């Protein structure tokens, strides 16, 4: 399953959209300047617990 | 499919681990203080394109 | 009760406003670039206490 | 409806928990150092749209 | 005493200025994009002490 | 009216509390490490309007 | 000695320059958007020591 | 007039205090870890104007 | 060529070091808390040019 | 092997691209404003382990 | 040896370039908006060691 | 002239100090956790001009 497009680095948005929609017809393509947000790899086995000063769960745990 | 544990907000790490491993035996549980990183919802239909000043792809596009 | 519009990811502002105002006629719609602020889920059961070096309440506690 | 506790500024965590649980027996109390995260007022009428370079919706819109 | 204008969320700058100057004729109105600075509630009873590694006062204490 | 204590820079928390409570018996004293939050002068004549991409009011305007 | 111009809040750059140069003919006036940098009060009696993990001086101490 | 102590880089806090108080008996010495705040050179001729979206003065101008 | 160890997520530092040194005997292993720095994928084909206001090269370009 | 172009500091993007593509015909050139992201030297011998509160591996270790 | 140009504060880029190139004919002049990056004084005697959780060297030490 | 110690990555502070002081007897060694500050290469030919909204010099230009 193809989930990354390293061949598109350096290419135009127009070329990137054409290639991505060929491989992933349902793609919802979002165009952002570098450094807008810090993306993160999704790990379906991982569950992060964010805890407070007393080691209680402070945010809703979710897979990723 | 259960991917979030809102019932665990306010509970201890020990209780959270017990509940999560019951629902998701393979979970790799990570314990972090609030505010360490900014997590983000994973959207399997979305592909973000991060672009440079000339609208060329600057980072490897990936699903999420 | 509908409080999220995942179907609007990738659509235009114009389409998003039309859909949101159909579902939520009172919506006050605000349009911001990605990464402007870090939004956070509202949890009506939760009360965060922000404390100082001596574990005294430093900000007004509020629900959320 | 009471949703804020300005009278607790300057008091201990122990006193704050006692008062909050009297007013809101279901409260899930989280204790964090000042400056950990930037909280934000929840506005049930507001819907923020976070948009990309081409004014398309980049994140799931939600009430708040 | 009116110190907040929740009714103005979603309205134009022009409408906001008209309403604010009606309620507060002396208002010095400043127009900034979201996320420029992090504003903070002013609490006339509170005095924050900002301390150094040795718990000495490092900045001039002021009310707020 | 005294609202600042420049004479306390360099002194201990204990000395600072004694002086502040003499001048302001109602003070709610909060002790934080330098750099925890960015405080800001309160200006009772000023009203900041935080606006979105379309120059609409995005946050509740308040005095300060 | 006048070192601050609170009367200029809300006025134009043009008006501000005229007033400041009347009071301080040598002023080197710099025009920046809000939030560009975090300015800090200069205290001629204060000397900050910035220290490393072993409590050694890590940066050149200077008055301010 | 001596306003900087480059000879103290690498020395202990104890040695630094002894030297600084010899040169500047009135010094109010503050000890902070590196990176706590971003200090800035004070320029007595300079006046920064921080402006809003409409080029109006948004903060009190001050010398420095 | 193995350059990533996804199987180590959730395991101890001790187990991780043992596995990494088996696969990569020369590894120089560094142990940091999450969120200390933002790491980035190295792309041997890519050359980033960081430019100033006038589109001149402002930093030494390097592969990566 | 040439992996850095210190001779290009101060030159135009156009000149930089010409020189880089002469030395590295496969270069994928990305043009970004200064300060967009914090780049980091790639060290093929190094493996960073990012750990959680309990010293467990929190992110996939990778060479660099 | 002249390494700083305090006389140029408040002057135009054009005037600054003329003066700097007179004093330093080899200068590679870079023009950036305030707040883009945090510059730092170079100290030829200093060597910073950046260490990990176990006090091992985590980055290549360099003079400065 | 040796100005960097890549051979010390992964070694202890004690070993690093011994090696650095052998090569550079005058070194003023500072020990900081990773991510405390963002260091930057010093370029003796470069002069950065930091400019304000009107392209006037806003900070003292210096070599580096």
Numbering used by the authors:
A (entry chain A), B (entry chain A), C (entry chain A), D (entry chain A), E (entry chain A), F (entry chain A), ...: 3 to 66
Question: What is written in the article reporting this PDB entry?
Answer:
The small (<70 residues) globular single-domain CI2 is a paradigm of two-state folding in which a sturdy native structure unfolds at an extremely slow rate via an all-or-none transition.
To identify possible spatial arrangements for assembly, we analyzed the crystal lattice of CI2 by X-ray crystallography. CI2 crystallizes in the hexagonal space group P622 in all the conditions we attempted that rendered crystals. On the lattice, the protein forms double hexameric rings in which the two rings are packed head to head and rotated by ~30°. An unexpected discovery was that we observed domain swapping at certain crystallization conditions. Indeed, crystals obtained using salt as primary precipitant follow the standard arrangement of early structural work on CI241 (left), whereas crystals grown with PEG feature domain-swapped dimers arranged in the same lattice structure and group symmetry (right).
